[PDB]
Amino acid sequence: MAIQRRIRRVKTVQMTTNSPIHRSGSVLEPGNWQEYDPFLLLMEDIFERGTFDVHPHRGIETVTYVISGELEHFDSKAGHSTLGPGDVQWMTAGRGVVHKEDPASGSTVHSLQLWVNLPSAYKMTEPRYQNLRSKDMPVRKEEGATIRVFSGSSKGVKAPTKNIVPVTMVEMIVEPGTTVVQDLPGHYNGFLYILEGSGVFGADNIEGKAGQALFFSRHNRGEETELNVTAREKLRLLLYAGEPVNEPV
Going by the annotation, the residues of the binding site for Fe(3+) are 57, 99
Q: In whole angstroms, how close is the CB of 57 to Fe ion at the nearest point?
A: 6
Build a one-symbol-per-residue string for 101-140: x at contacts with Fe ion by CB under 5 A, - elsewhere. Answer: ----------------------------------------
Q: In whole angstroms, how close is the CB of 90 to Fe ion at the nearest point?
A: 14
CB 234 within 8 A of CB 177: no
The span of 48-56, 123-131, 147-155, 175-183 binding Fe ion (CB under 5 A) equals 48-56
Nearer to Fe ion, 52 or 210 (CB): 52
User: How many residues are recorded in the chain?
Assistant: 249
**Residue 63: partners with Cβ closer than 8 Å, 6 or more residues away:** 88, 89, 90, 91, 113, 114, 115, 116, 151, 167, 169
Q: Scan residues 178-197 and list those touching Fe ion (CB under 5 A).
A: none
CB 70 within 8 A of CB 82: yes
CB 175 within 8 A of CB 231: yes
Of 202, 209, 205, 199, residue with least CA distance to 226: 202
Residue nearest to Fe ion (CB): 55
Annotated binding-site ranges: 55, 57, 99, 101
Q: In whole angstroms, how close is the CB of 58 to Fe ion at the nearest point?
A: 11
Nearer to Fe ion, 72 or 183 (CB): 72
Of 18, 114, 19, residue with least CA distance to 66: 114
The span of 53-61, 80-88, 103-111, 163-171 binding Fe ion (CB under 5 A) equals 53-61
Nearer to Fe ion, 43 or 137 (CB): 43
Q: What angle is formed at CA 182 by the lines to CA 178 and CA 185, rounded to 5 degrees?
A: 165
Q: In whole angstroms, how close is the CB of 86 to Fe ion at the nearest point?
A: 21
The span of 10-18, 49-57, 162-170, 180-188 binding Fe ion (CB under 5 A) equals 49-57
Q: In whole angstroms, how close is the CB of 66 to Fe ion at the nearest point?
A: 15
Could you give the CA distance from residue 107 to residue 115 in angstroms, rounded to a whole number? Answer: 24
Could you give the CA distance from residue 162 to residue 155 in angstroms, rounded to a whole number? Answer: 18
Q: What angle is formed at CA 224 by the lines to CA 219 and CA 228, rounded to 5 degrees?
A: 85
Binders of Fe ion: how many residues, by CB under 5 A?
1
The span of 55-63, 124-132, 211-219, 226-234 binding Fe ion (CB under 5 A) equals 55-63
Q: In whole angstroms, how close is the CB of 99 to Fe ion at the nearest point?
A: 6
Amino acid 231 reads A
Nearer to Fe ion, 94 or 197 (CB): 94
Q: Where are the alpha helices (H) located in 95-244, listed in sequence order?
A: none
Binding residues vs Fe ion (CB under 5 A): 55
